[PDB]
Amino acid sequence: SKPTDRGQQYKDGKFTQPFSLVNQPDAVGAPINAGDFAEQINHIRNSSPRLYGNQSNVYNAVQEWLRAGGDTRNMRQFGIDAWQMEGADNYGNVQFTGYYTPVIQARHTRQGEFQYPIYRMPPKRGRLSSRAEIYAGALSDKYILAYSNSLMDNFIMDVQGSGYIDFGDGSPLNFFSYAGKNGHAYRSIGKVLIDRGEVKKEDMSMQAIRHWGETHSEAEVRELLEQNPSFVFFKPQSFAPVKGASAVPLVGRASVASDRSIIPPGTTLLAEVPLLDNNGKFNGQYELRLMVALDVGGAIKGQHFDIYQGIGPEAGHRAGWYNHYGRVWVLKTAP
């Protein structure tokens, strides 16, 4: 009837439309990320001047409001309208998932836990080998770019097509991009997990696949991954800050991926974000933050938001691996 296990709340009435204008958002206090929000807007200003010009009236009003105190009760003084989203259940519970930029730990030689090679493009002959054959050592060692400490991390990098690598020697972060693919068509690992009853369809995502790997043995991970005979090859690439589809560098917890047809890029959002414990479970608390839609995702549709958590392990922990719920108000100004 009315579950609360994932952060759902029912104190804002029943919604009859996708967005509803409220006199004052049901959120106490001020956003906690004013600095990050400003930094995010500055990135839009410099990286996407066209988008900035079109939304500047909103950003300016929000900035003025924040400097004056940022309390949600004083938003109207600045012409800021708050449109509450009905969410996934028409009770205002907005579906939230998280994503982040992983930093793969790797070494130049195979040592200790680092035993999973990441490859550059081999000759056409070697490209014919399946993932299983490659895992078995079908390719020469001269094509190995690095030895990671996680087979699952390598796969997630395969799907993404690129990834950041830390060799642990204090040198600059390494970036590797898509160079090519092997001669085998890919198969969905997520579909395999869904068919096996291991992961729920609605909770399926790259993060969910990541969590499955963490809760399973090396043999089980390898067995699963081998169900996809495709394999990806990479090449060194000059470092570039993480950007969303909008081409704007993303600021952790100040940006989201959203459905363009519902929440256009550049849209300002005030959100009560559900916090998670060490097991990825809603811990009872929420954080009031401002965020801008600056990315998209293949499975991020409707009123579902994918919060960019940032880069590294901490961002990874905050990302979670299944659906959670918060409240969101789209901020706009009336002419």
Curated annotation (Swiss-Prot):
The cysteines joined by S-S bonds are none
Tell me the Pfam families matching this sequence.
3D, MltA
What temperature-related properties of activity are listed for this protein? Loses rapidly its activity at temperatures above 30 degrees Celsius.
Q: What is an example of a GO molecular function annotated in this UniProt entry? A: hydrolase activity, hydrolyzing O-glycosyl compounds
Question: Which EC class is the enzyme in?
Answer: lyase
The effect of pH on activity is described as: Optimum pH is 4.0-4.5.
Superkingdom as given in the UniProt entry: Bacteria
First-listed, main subcellular location of the protein, grouped into a coarse class:
membrane
Could you identify this protein by its name?
Membrane-bound lytic murein transglycosylase A
Its source organism is Escherichia coli (strain K12)
